[PDB]
Design a protein around this nucleic acid. Structure first.
Length: 184
RNA sequence: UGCUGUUUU
């Protein structure tokens, strides 16, 4: 059962690091508010209101233990273990031309998922395909999923590898895979 | 990053 706990804690790490990451934090009004009141410190009481974390755990001890063993070294834990924050060692990148051009060059468009596909289905599908930093499910005005996504890879190398892999499928369907540069 | 809408159409 120590095995299941370790796997649970990896997920908790990944989820919280996403929330405070480069691809969510700057567009996350609710998280931004909480981050201004203390020196970046946000209480665990408030973090467990985030739905994906909430399904993983509501136990403070499990979250604190997860982030202590994390290899990303993004999150710090307060002295009293009640609050977490993004390390002042990891500032948010200034959104420059260089930065956005660098993100664009490793961002990929994929179309051909079923419209009833969930984020968890897509994540499962992307597991062996390279380090992915963001998944954006493209939606209509009324919030129906189109069956296309934008994915941001860690490096152009890992994006290129993926884009150049021949006949990629989601179960049944052939996928259209394009650099976001090539999509309009 | 992105996406979205924006009548001094």
């Amino acid at each position: 059962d120590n095995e299941k706990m370790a796997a649970l804690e990896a997920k908790i790490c990944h989820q919280i690091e996403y929330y405070f990451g480069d691809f969510n934090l700057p567009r996350d009004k609710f998280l931004k508010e909480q981050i201004k009141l203390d020196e970046g410190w946000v209480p665990l009481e408030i973090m467990i209101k985030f739905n994906r974390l909430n399904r993983l755990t509501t136990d403070f001890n499990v979250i604190v233990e997860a982030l202590s063993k994390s290899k990303a070294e993004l999150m710090e834990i307060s002295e009293d273990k009640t609050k977490i924050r993004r390390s002042p060692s990891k500032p948010l990148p200034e959104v420059t031309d260089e930065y956005k051009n660098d993100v664009k060059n490793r961002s990929v468009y994929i179309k051909g998922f079923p419209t009833d596909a969930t984020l968890d289905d897509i994540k499962e599908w992307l597991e062996d395909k390279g380090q992915v930093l963001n998944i954006q499910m493209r939606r209509t005005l009324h919030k129906a999923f189109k069956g296309s996504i934008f994915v941001v890879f860690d490096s152009i190398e890992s994006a290129k590898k993926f884009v150049e892999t021949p006949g990629q499928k989601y179960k049944e369907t052939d996928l259209l895979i394009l650099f976001k540069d090539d999509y309009f």
